[PDB]
């Protein structure tokens, strides 16, 4: 969790289309029931909602060149994935009305974390590397899915756990995004390297990825800035420098 | 249309609404209308909802005086 | 042996009192140290190391002693594992029991106020031809030498003093054991 | 106009609103004696939302209230609802005790096409759609089926929930609170057996990880442990209830005073 | 050993009578005090201290006696745990059983009306060489001295009188035990 | 009138607590109602 | 072509019994469509997962 599986899909969508919105996202955590498969292809003839058609089929017909994201595939019922067998083999999906929808100009991304917890709760009771980790996670993926489904997939990719330096770079990216967002509200923010390192070290938690970074950014930068904004509005049209002398974060107000 | 396109559309339509409501519509009002409608109104779509926001605000301020 | 039932959202956990203590990292050595008990204790220590290798393991000793090989297996498992093993003497610690009581982490070997500790040379037996009796005697003397060496290294006393004290059954109170260096402090109520 | 449309306080922050927001902890403490950290975290979330520093693509805040019975988690949620709206009835309350079965998740998002009740969408989606600025309470989350919370994964991370009809409801201006109860036996069994608040919090948090998925707890903004009520806290609770009753009987012109010994009893 | 299915709320789990009584902080000592029984008692005492460090524990004693070291372990565990332990003498508390009966919390040692208690010097044996017999005799004499000292401390009586009375098997009724100081009051029936 | 609160589904108690603590359900007011719940609450031996 | 016949509900193929035995399938309008000049192919991989799951615990087409 918190490694970048969904962020990579959003980044690809933005690179191909200019926005993360222009991505057909299917959250499979709402397909835990087998009968939820109707949401993809529509209700059979003679049943309510038949004229509405399939949501995924209509969206793909409306935009044949798109990125399709099936987020958290392991959350769905096992049989729901048989609907994707035809898509991965011929790029075709037939609507309930009988209309064949073309998927041959789409990128299909499926995200999962099966086995990821198993590598953390594994405890050897008797007295690692990338290869063994990928081997055991691939084995768990084989256990969780049928061989024919995994056989149609072009690539199975193992997302490695983030390191300290990569976490620091992620902190830099988050700080840059926050600064660019606050500049619109006329709030200039500069966060020094020592402050970013202290945020990274304080929000370090190896098995949670980069979400503790988000929580740390919130609790360290956003709360104090919100207090300054609400305390008589002493930030507007000014520049705030966030420093860490060595014991606590210091916030200094100056002019542009 | 994008946000900048909607800003241009609203700025172009400004003269008609100033004539109808007999008030002045600032550029900051246009920017606020488009941004707030884009972020906080999701069921409807950008140009119509921005125009609707501008029209309702203008009607309210006109009836105030 | 009573049964303890713990209720969670997932289900029911039916511990017996020893397993319930083991859940809190308590290992009970309360019988003669034979192969089965040593194997069980080694497995418990290994599992407790696996579950978390940083917290401390607690070993409760009330035993007349037993096999030297079993006690050596327990000692090796204690010294090999990363987590520290606190040894608390309840009741009796005799022969191998005292050896394992001294085998705990430094600053972490305890005994109850009126507990008794007994140190003495190991028992054995030789039977058969003269050569076989010689082999058995050599083995038992080597074992006694190894035990004296470990006890001297682990209690700070000279090998000669331990040799002299272990010739006969030496009974030591908690205060005498603290003075002798077998335990580290008595647990005041 | 946009605030009137959506109900979200998008108007400029005046001095009265500033001082009301800065004293949010006192307002919540007026109804909730105890639990300083939970009130502080909730107030920080609200102030961050109203200062414009919230991430626009995520909800205002997701919190898990974990503690014993009768401690004040639901009362804290109701007090937050009163602070943000003016009445407790405006809060959206979802009782997880009737979600013991996996198929009950259809009540949250709707029934799939071809199935009964598909015309009427999910209750939660419709409620949030008509009230985008709301507090959502998931009461007694332990009693619910573990897989029901997989739905909330897409809400705590992106703020969007899609119903069966295909309509997407934005949760980005809501506060989501989940309450978990640990029985007296439960936290009695978590104590250490052997010779000789921090450890209690640690062990309750560790036990919480064994009941929920790591990616579900990774998306929660803050997990807050409610401490057990002390003697003086119970005395203050009695004082506050007596004060409320005295006000309610004084509006009927009946004057009543309760002695300290009576309150202690 | 009958089982009991009575449990609150769900009521699905079944207990044996001793495990069910353990939940009510009732501990039964109805056999000779050997290492296994002592270890079980110590584990139960630790478990009950963990369950609640304030509520009192109930210890019903009916034992001819047993190992002195086992009784010492039980005594140390009783005197070490924070919660108070009530000792209720059922039938006979003899030898180390009477020692554990005096080990209860002060003012919390009880005995049933037609109950009996016995106090005597520890038994033992010494076999082998003269030196080994001397060592064993020294050990048993020191054990008797320590037992007498603890009994004198917990009964408020001179160690000379205890030494004189423990020379032979001294049988005392509940009233005689109360007058002696081993117990605090005789549990009159309702 | 709640006839036979025993074998009813346990979710009824939730609604009952909601009515008895607040007096309103989602609004319907219960402040002018009387809540009556009618309840219907072998020896292996010689006796 | 009926692709991956095991992926369907077991009861669905009851509708093919008339097709495979008489070549007739009556639609809802009461019209009988003849299947007597058709080739019917049903592909499946039943037992594939059992066979990659079957592990022999004791010491070919
Ligand atoms: N710190 C506190 N301050 C004020 N009232 C409290 C406090 N703790 C508990 N209470 C009172 O006790 C009751 C607790 O019920 P509640 O917290 O809703 O139960 P649960 O936590 O099981 O949902 C509330 O009605 C509340 O008035
Ligand atoms: Mg996330």
Tab-separated table of N, CA and C in Angstrom, chain A residues 1-2 6 10 20 25 27 29-30 32-33 35-39 42-44 47-50 52-53 55 71-72 74-75 113 117 177-178 181-182 185 187 205 207-212 214-215 218-219 221-227 229-232, chain D residues 13 15 18-19 21-22 41 44-45 47-48 50-58 101-105 109 112-116 118-119 147-148 150-154 157-158 160-166 172 209 213-215 217-222:
chain	number	residue	atom	x	y	z
A	1	UNK	N	0.829	-1.197	0.000
A	1	UNK	CA	0.000	0.000	0.000
A	1	UNK	C	0.868	1.253	0.000
A	2	UNK	N	0.354	2.324	-0.599
A	2	UNK	CA	1.061	3.587	-0.641
A	2	UNK	C	2.354	3.580	-1.420
A	6	UNK	N	-1.681	3.240	-8.137
A	6	UNK	CA	-2.726	4.099	-8.682
A	6	UNK	C	-2.182	5.425	-9.196
A	10	UNK	N	-2.737	7.225	-12.876
A	10	UNK	CA	-3.174	8.609	-13.038
A	10	UNK	C	-2.153	9.428	-13.820
A	20	UNK	N	-6.086	13.845	-15.149
A	20	UNK	CA	-6.365	12.582	-14.475
A	20	UNK	C	-7.829	12.186	-14.589
A	25	UNK	N	-12.160	4.801	-14.706
A	25	UNK	CA	-11.780	4.110	-13.484
A	25	UNK	C	-12.923	3.224	-13.015
A	27	UNK	N	-13.648	0.967	-9.838
A	27	UNK	CA	-13.294	0.487	-8.510
A	27	UNK	C	-13.999	-0.839	-8.266
A	29	UNK	N	-13.979	-2.694	-5.642
A	29	UNK	CA	-14.445	-2.915	-4.280
A	29	UNK	C	-15.962	-2.871	-4.168
A	30	UNK	N	-16.661	-2.441	-5.217
A	30	UNK	CA	-18.115	-2.487	-5.269
A	30	UNK	C	-18.627	-3.637	-6.124
A	32	UNK	N	-18.071	-6.882	-5.093
A	32	UNK	CA	-17.917	-8.026	-4.202
A	32	UNK	C	-19.001	-9.074	-4.412
A	33	UNK	N	-20.152	-8.682	-4.942
A	33	UNK	CA	-21.208	-9.613	-5.304
A	33	UNK	C	-21.076	-9.994	-6.772
A	35	UNK	N	-23.428	-10.674	-8.866
A	35	UNK	CA	-24.451	-10.070	-9.710
A	35	UNK	C	-24.162	-8.609	-10.027
A	36	UNK	N	-23.101	-8.040	-9.459
A	36	UNK	CA	-22.720	-6.664	-9.746
A	36	UNK	C	-22.133	-6.536	-11.147
A	37	UNK	N	-21.924	-7.667	-11.820
A	37	UNK	CA	-21.366	-7.697	-13.169
A	37	UNK	C	-22.317	-7.001	-14.137
A	38	UNK	N	-23.582	-6.855	-13.735
A	38	UNK	CA	-24.548	-6.140	-14.563
A	38	UNK	C	-24.154	-4.679	-14.744
A	39	UNK	N	-23.394	-4.129	-13.795
A	39	UNK	CA	-22.975	-2.736	-13.897
A	39	UNK	C	-22.045	-2.511	-15.081
A	42	UNK	N	-24.810	-4.254	-18.369
A	42	UNK	CA	-26.237	-4.001	-18.363
A	42	UNK	C	-27.057	-5.217	-17.986
A	43	UNK	N	-28.332	-4.948	-17.668
A	43	UNK	CA	-29.286	-5.965	-17.257
A	43	UNK	C	-29.783	-6.760	-18.460
A	44	UNK	N	-30.026	-8.056	-18.283
A	44	UNK	CA	-30.493	-8.891	-19.397
A	44	UNK	C	-31.856	-8.436	-19.887
A	47	UNK	N	-35.558	-7.324	-17.949
A	47	UNK	CA	-35.272	-6.965	-16.569
A	47	UNK	C	-35.053	-5.462	-16.470
A	48	UNK	N	-35.257	-4.933	-15.260
A	48	UNK	CA	-35.231	-3.490	-15.060
A	48	UNK	C	-33.848	-2.936	-15.379
A	49	UNK	N	-33.822	-1.780	-16.038
A	49	UNK	CA	-32.575	-1.163	-16.434
A	49	UNK	C	-31.969	-1.700	-17.708
A	50	UNK	N	-32.696	-2.537	-18.451
A	50	UNK	CA	-32.156	-3.098	-19.684
A	50	UNK	C	-31.870	-2.019	-20.719
A	52	UNK	N	-30.912	0.954	-20.265
A	52	UNK	CA	-29.835	1.867	-19.896
A	52	UNK	C	-28.491	1.405	-20.447
A	53	UNK	N	-28.330	0.104	-20.668
A	53	UNK	CA	-27.086	-0.421	-21.192
A	53	UNK	C	-26.008	-0.536	-20.134
A	55	UNK	N	-22.579	0.517	-18.324
A	55	UNK	CA	-21.867	1.770	-18.090
A	55	UNK	C	-20.473	1.739	-18.703
A	71	UNK	N	-9.120	-0.825	-10.162
A	71	UNK	CA	-8.397	-0.609	-8.919
A	71	UNK	C	-8.785	-1.669	-7.896
A	72	UNK	N	-7.781	-2.226	-7.217
A	72	UNK	CA	-7.982	-3.195	-6.140
A	72	UNK	C	-8.772	-4.407	-6.635
A	74	UNK	N	-8.316	-7.568	-6.239
A	74	UNK	CA	-8.546	-8.653	-5.293
A	74	UNK	C	-9.788	-8.436	-4.438
A	75	UNK	N	-10.347	-7.226	-4.430
A	75	UNK	CA	-11.531	-6.939	-3.632
A	75	UNK	C	-12.812	-7.473	-4.255
A	113	UNK	N	-2.759	-5.834	-4.178
A	113	UNK	CA	-1.783	-5.960	-3.103
A	113	UNK	C	-1.830	-7.340	-2.456
A	117	UNK	N	0.792	-8.125	2.259
A	117	UNK	CA	0.679	-8.303	3.699
A	117	UNK	C	1.352	-9.597	4.143
A	177	UNK	N	3.947	20.816	-4.740
A	177	UNK	CA	2.537	20.881	-5.112
A	177	UNK	C	1.748	21.756	-4.143
A	178	UNK	N	2.012	21.620	-2.841
A	178	UNK	CA	1.337	22.461	-1.857
A	178	UNK	C	1.677	23.932	-2.058
A	181	UNK	N	-0.167	25.245	-5.038
A	181	UNK	CA	-1.586	25.413	-4.751
A	181	UNK	C	-1.846	26.640	-3.885
A	182	UNK	N	-0.992	26.893	-2.892
A	182	UNK	CA	-1.198	28.035	-2.009
A	182	UNK	C	-0.834	29.355	-2.673
A	185	UNK	N	-3.896	31.145	-3.774
A	185	UNK	CA	-4.544	31.861	-2.685
A	185	UNK	C	-3.700	33.011	-2.156
A	187	UNK	N	-0.531	33.048	-1.044
A	187	UNK	CA	0.203	32.652	0.157
A	187	UNK	C	1.511	32.026	-0.322
A	205	UNK	N	7.229	5.444	7.963
A	205	UNK	CA	6.587	4.227	8.437
A	205	UNK	C	6.656	3.202	7.309
A	207	UNK	N	5.883	0.142	6.265
A	207	UNK	CA	4.848	-0.681	5.650
A	207	UNK	C	3.606	0.109	5.262
A	208	UNK	N	3.631	1.436	5.376
A	208	UNK	CA	2.507	2.260	4.960
A	208	UNK	C	2.810	3.141	3.756
A	209	UNK	N	4.023	3.093	3.218
A	209	UNK	CA	4.304	3.820	1.989
A	209	UNK	C	4.404	5.316	2.217
A	210	UNK	N	3.811	6.085	1.304
A	210	UNK	CA	3.932	7.537	1.308
A	210	UNK	C	2.699	8.258	1.839
A	211	UNK	N	1.743	7.545	2.421
A	211	UNK	CA	0.579	8.176	3.036
A	211	UNK	C	0.916	8.786	4.399
A	212	UNK	N	1.779	8.156	5.209
A	212	UNK	CA	2.286	8.868	6.390
A	212	UNK	C	2.958	10.176	6.039
A	214	UNK	N	1.798	12.204	3.739
A	214	UNK	CA	0.660	13.115	3.644
A	214	UNK	C	0.206	13.543	5.032
A	215	UNK	N	0.080	12.580	5.947
A	215	UNK	CA	-0.357	12.908	7.301
A	215	UNK	C	0.634	13.839	7.991
A	218	UNK	N	0.328	17.370	6.590
A	218	UNK	CA	-0.834	17.986	7.220
A	218	UNK	C	-0.487	18.505	8.609
A	219	UNK	N	-0.110	17.588	9.505
A	219	UNK	CA	0.069	17.921	10.914
A	219	UNK	C	1.201	18.910	11.155
A	221	UNK	N	2.708	21.304	8.571
A	221	UNK	CA	2.629	22.564	7.851
A	221	UNK	C	1.228	23.152	7.905
A	222	UNK	N	0.207	22.333	7.642
A	222	UNK	CA	-1.105	22.894	7.342
A	222	UNK	C	-1.831	23.378	8.592
A	223	UNK	N	-1.623	22.725	9.737
A	223	UNK	CA	-2.305	23.151	10.957
A	223	UNK	C	-1.817	24.521	11.417
A	224	UNK	N	-0.497	24.706	11.474
A	224	UNK	CA	0.049	25.978	11.936
A	224	UNK	C	-0.272	27.107	10.964
A	225	UNK	N	-0.202	26.831	9.660
A	225	UNK	CA	-0.576	27.838	8.673
A	225	UNK	C	-2.049	28.203	8.792
A	226	UNK	N	-2.906	27.214	9.055
A	226	UNK	CA	-4.323	27.500	9.255
A	226	UNK	C	-4.542	28.363	10.491
A	227	UNK	N	-3.812	28.082	11.573
A	227	UNK	CA	-3.917	28.925	12.760
A	227	UNK	C	-3.483	30.354	12.461
A	229	UNK	N	-3.583	31.862	9.560
A	229	UNK	CA	-4.600	32.471	8.708
A	229	UNK	C	-5.806	32.901	9.535
A	230	UNK	N	-6.239	32.060	10.470
A	230	UNK	CA	-7.407	32.378	11.278
A	230	UNK	C	-7.102	33.324	12.433
A	231	UNK	N	-5.828	33.523	12.773
A	231	UNK	CA	-5.444	34.422	13.862
A	231	UNK	C	-5.240	35.846	13.341
A	232	UNK	N	-6.336	36.444	12.889
A	232	UNK	CA	-6.284	37.802	12.393
A	232	UNK	C	-5.747	37.957	10.990
D	13	UNK	N	-14.037	34.751	5.746
D	13	UNK	CA	-13.955	34.500	7.179
D	13	UNK	C	-13.920	35.848	7.889
D	15	UNK	N	-14.466	38.277	11.552
D	15	UNK	CA	-13.897	38.183	12.893
D	15	UNK	C	-14.737	37.281	13.789
D	18	UNK	N	-14.039	33.794	12.753
D	18	UNK	CA	-12.684	33.452	13.174
D	18	UNK	C	-12.652	33.062	14.644
D	19	UNK	N	-13.250	33.889	15.503
D	19	UNK	CA	-13.227	33.598	16.932
D	19	UNK	C	-14.090	32.390	17.273
D	21	UNK	N	-14.372	29.737	15.259
D	21	UNK	CA	-13.581	28.585	14.840
D	21	UNK	C	-12.421	28.336	15.795
D	22	UNK	N	-11.766	29.406	16.249
D	22	UNK	CA	-10.629	29.250	17.149
D	22	UNK	C	-11.036	28.701	18.509
D	41	UNK	N	-7.909	17.031	17.474
D	41	UNK	CA	-7.744	16.575	16.097
D	41	UNK	C	-8.932	16.981	15.233
D	44	UNK	N	-8.695	20.704	14.591
D	44	UNK	CA	-7.651	20.988	13.615
D	44	UNK	C	-8.117	20.659	12.206
D	45	UNK	N	-8.827	19.541	12.040
D	45	UNK	CA	-9.354	19.195	10.723
D	45	UNK	C	-10.330	20.254	10.224
D	47	UNK	N	-10.590	23.449	11.151
D	47	UNK	CA	-9.896	24.705	10.893
D	47	UNK	C	-9.082	24.629	9.609
D	48	UNK	N	-8.446	23.483	9.360
D	48	UNK	CA	-7.720	23.280	8.115
D	48	UNK	C	-8.654	23.330	6.915
D	50	UNK	N	-11.521	25.036	6.740
D	50	UNK	CA	-12.027	26.389	6.543
D	50	UNK	C	-10.937	27.406	6.230
D	51	UNK	N	-9.667	27.047	6.382
D	51	UNK	CA	-8.569	27.932	6.020
D	51	UNK	C	-8.160	27.797	4.560
D	52	UNK	N	-8.735	26.845	3.831
D	52	UNK	CA	-8.389	26.638	2.442
D	52	UNK	C	-7.159	25.796	2.204
D	53	UNK	N	-6.621	25.155	3.238
D	53	UNK	CA	-5.429	24.330	3.112
D	53	UNK	C	-5.747	22.856	2.905
D	54	UNK	N	-7.024	22.490	2.854
D	54	UNK	CA	-7.396	21.105	2.608
D	54	UNK	C	-7.061	20.714	1.175
D	55	UNK	N	-6.648	19.468	0.992
D	55	UNK	CA	-6.450	18.939	-0.348
D	55	UNK	C	-7.806	18.870	-1.041
D	56	UNK	N	-7.994	19.549	-2.175
D	56	UNK	CA	-9.332	19.603	-2.784
D	56	UNK	C	-9.875	18.253	-3.213
D	57	UNK	N	-9.022	17.249	-3.405
D	57	UNK	CA	-9.441	15.959	-3.931
D	57	UNK	C	-9.648	14.915	-2.839
D	58	UNK	N	-9.661	15.326	-1.580
D	58	UNK	CA	-9.837	14.420	-0.458
D	58	UNK	C	-10.860	15.015	0.494
D	101	UNK	N	-23.960	-8.554	7.204
D	101	UNK	CA	-23.895	-9.443	6.057
D	101	UNK	C	-23.360	-8.673	4.852
D	102	UNK	N	-22.624	-9.388	3.999
D	102	UNK	CA	-21.906	-8.750	2.899
D	102	UNK	C	-22.859	-8.073	1.919
D	103	UNK	N	-24.014	-8.687	1.655
D	103	UNK	CA	-24.936	-8.119	0.678
D	103	UNK	C	-25.617	-6.849	1.173
D	104	UNK	N	-25.464	-6.499	2.452
D	104	UNK	CA	-26.059	-5.271	2.965
D	104	UNK	C	-25.372	-4.025	2.423
D	105	UNK	N	-24.238	-4.183	1.737
D	105	UNK	CA	-23.542	-3.037	1.158
D	105	UNK	C	-24.355	-2.427	0.025
D	109	UNK	N	-24.813	1.812	-1.812
D	109	UNK	CA	-24.592	2.263	-3.183
D	109	UNK	C	-25.740	1.941	-4.124
D	112	UNK	N	-27.691	-3.640	-8.174
D	112	UNK	CA	-27.203	-3.700	-9.558
D	112	UNK	C	-28.355	-3.738	-10.545
D	113	UNK	N	-28.118	-3.356	-11.802
D	113	UNK	CA	-29.210	-3.328	-12.782
D	113	UNK	C	-29.848	-4.699	-12.947
D	114	UNK	N	-31.169	-4.702	-13.107
D	114	UNK	CA	-31.934	-5.926	-13.160
D	114	UNK	C	-32.412	-6.435	-11.820
D	115	UNK	N	-32.036	-5.782	-10.726
D	115	UNK	CA	-32.371	-6.230	-9.385
D	115	UNK	C	-33.269	-5.213	-8.693
D	116	UNK	N	-34.073	-5.717	-7.751
D	116	UNK	CA	-35.100	-4.898	-7.120
D	116	UNK	C	-34.463	-3.717	-6.402
D	118	UNK	N	-33.327	-1.056	-7.874
D	118	UNK	CA	-32.318	-0.375	-8.677
D	118	UNK	C	-32.752	1.038	-9.037
D	119	UNK	N	-34.061	1.276	-9.134
D	119	UNK	CA	-34.548	2.608	-9.479
D	119	UNK	C	-34.168	3.628	-8.414
D	147	UNK	N	-15.730	-6.814	5.018
D	147	UNK	CA	-15.596	-6.427	3.620
D	147	UNK	C	-16.477	-5.245	3.238
D	148	UNK	N	-17.371	-4.808	4.126
D	148	UNK	CA	-18.208	-3.649	3.826
D	148	UNK	C	-17.358	-2.386	3.741
D	150	UNK	N	-14.504	-1.994	2.435
D	150	UNK	CA	-13.780	-1.843	1.178
D	150	UNK	C	-14.403	-0.763	0.306
D	151	UNK	N	-15.698	-0.496	0.492
D	151	UNK	CA	-16.362	0.578	-0.240
D	151	UNK	C	-15.792	1.934	0.147
D	152	UNK	N	-15.551	2.155	1.438
D	152	UNK	CA	-15.038	3.431	1.916
D	152	UNK	C	-13.610	3.705	1.466
D	153	UNK	N	-12.918	2.706	0.915
D	153	UNK	CA	-11.541	2.906	0.474
D	153	UNK	C	-11.454	3.971	-0.611
D	154	UNK	N	-12.372	3.935	-1.572
D	154	UNK	CA	-12.394	4.902	-2.658
D	154	UNK	C	-12.925	6.261	-2.227
D	157	UNK	N	-9.809	8.131	-0.044
D	157	UNK	CA	-8.644	8.421	-0.871
D	157	UNK	C	-8.919	9.424	-1.978
D	158	UNK	N	-10.093	9.362	-2.604
D	158	UNK	CA	-10.432	10.250	-3.703
D	158	UNK	C	-11.663	11.102	-3.436
D	160	UNK	N	-14.747	10.278	-3.900
D	160	UNK	CA	-15.782	9.996	-4.882
D	160	UNK	C	-16.347	8.605	-4.651
D	161	UNK	N	-17.673	8.508	-4.653
D	161	UNK	CA	-18.359	7.226	-4.595
D	161	UNK	C	-19.373	7.180	-5.726
D	162	UNK	N	-19.325	6.116	-6.519
D	162	UNK	CA	-20.202	5.959	-7.670
D	162	UNK	C	-21.318	4.983	-7.331
D	163	UNK	N	-22.558	5.416	-7.530
D	163	UNK	CA	-23.691	4.540	-7.300
D	163	UNK	C	-23.882	3.597	-8.484
D	164	UNK	N	-24.879	2.721	-8.363
D	164	UNK	CA	-25.153	1.765	-9.427
D	164	UNK	C	-25.615	2.443	-10.711
D	165	UNK	N	-26.355	3.545	-10.607
D	165	UNK	CA	-26.842	4.250	-11.785
D	165	UNK	C	-25.723	4.891	-12.595
D	166	UNK	N	-24.507	4.956	-12.056
D	166	UNK	CA	-23.391	5.597	-12.715
D	166	UNK	C	-23.094	6.998	-12.228
D	172	UNK	N	-15.839	15.109	-0.839
D	172	UNK	CA	-14.677	15.942	-0.576
D	172	UNK	C	-14.953	17.077	0.401
D	209	UNK	N	-5.140	-3.209	14.306
D	209	UNK	CA	-4.524	-3.632	13.054
D	209	UNK	C	-4.880	-5.066	12.689
D	213	UNK	N	-7.809	-4.035	7.379
D	213	UNK	CA	-6.751	-4.184	6.396
D	213	UNK	C	-5.764	-3.020	6.496
D	214	UNK	N	-4.479	-3.268	6.224
D	214	UNK	CA	-3.488	-2.183	6.340
D	214	UNK	C	-3.756	-1.013	5.412
D	215	UNK	N	-4.307	-1.266	4.225
D	215	UNK	CA	-4.608	-0.173	3.310
D	215	UNK	C	-5.853	0.604	3.711
D	217	UNK	N	-6.487	1.262	7.067
D	217	UNK	CA	-5.952	2.118	8.116
D	217	UNK	C	-4.943	3.124	7.579
D	218	UNK	N	-4.329	2.843	6.430
D	218	UNK	CA	-3.402	3.787	5.824
D	218	UNK	C	-4.106	5.017	5.269
D	219	UNK	N	-5.386	4.902	4.923
D	219	UNK	CA	-6.131	6.015	4.355
D	219	UNK	C	-6.849	6.855	5.400
D	220	UNK	N	-6.844	6.432	6.663
D	220	UNK	CA	-7.478	7.213	7.717
D	220	UNK	C	-6.550	8.346	8.131
D	221	UNK	N	-7.097	9.561	8.200
D	221	UNK	CA	-6.288	10.716	8.574
D	221	UNK	C	-5.739	10.591	9.988
D	222	UNK	N	-6.548	10.118	10.930
D	222	UNK	CA	-6.092	10.021	12.307
D	222	UNK	C	-6.892	8.947	13.026
